[PDB]
């Protein structure tokens, strides 16, 4: 089997968070079902009704050191915006990549990103980047290129 985990977008900040459980559902005549969500990092007081189609998706993947090759200009990624008073995962697009030789610490590559929600830009290391699961495809392709 292959497990499928989810992340959901909060209406409080527009950031994405891991989902620990789905507790309930509600339906509308107009469409767009909603699901009651318990967040992995938080408790019952932070439970939220979430638009299933628009604000729930398969969990983004924290990148392995070698997986930097699967992060391309033009990609949507989930990027850790770390600041003064808060540090949250926000959708961003990769504008450019500065790819450097890896060492003992792993990936030395750097990525210029632009956050979707505020158009702000930042240079980030791989450790702040989560790639969408479909990019696994890319990796698989690369894996097929290896020697038998």
């Amino acid at each position: 089997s292959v497990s499928v985990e989810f992340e959901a977008k909060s209406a409080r900040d527009g950031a994405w968070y891991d989902v620990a459980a789905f507790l309930s559902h509600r339906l509308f005549e107009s469409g767009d079902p909603e699901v009651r969500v318990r967040f992995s990092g938080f408790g019952a007081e932070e439970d939220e009704w979430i638009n299933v189609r628009k604000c729930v998706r398969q969990r983004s993947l924290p990148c392995e050191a070698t997986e930097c090759v699967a992060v391309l200009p033009g990609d949507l990624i989930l990027c850790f915006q770390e600041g003064k008073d808060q540090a949250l995962y926000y959708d961003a697009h990769v504008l450019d990549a500065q790819r450097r030789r890896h060492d003992v610490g792993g990936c030395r590559c750097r990525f210029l990103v632009r956050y979707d929600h505020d158009s702000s830009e930042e240079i980030v290391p791989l450790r702040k980047v989560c790639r969408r699961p479909e990019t696994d495809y890319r990796l698989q392709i690369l894996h097929a290129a290896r020697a038998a």
Binding site: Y17, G41, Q86, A87, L88, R127
Partner: peptide, 8 residues
Amino acid sequence: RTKQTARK
């Protein structure tokens, strides 16, 4: 695969 801890 572990994410960093979000702080609100």
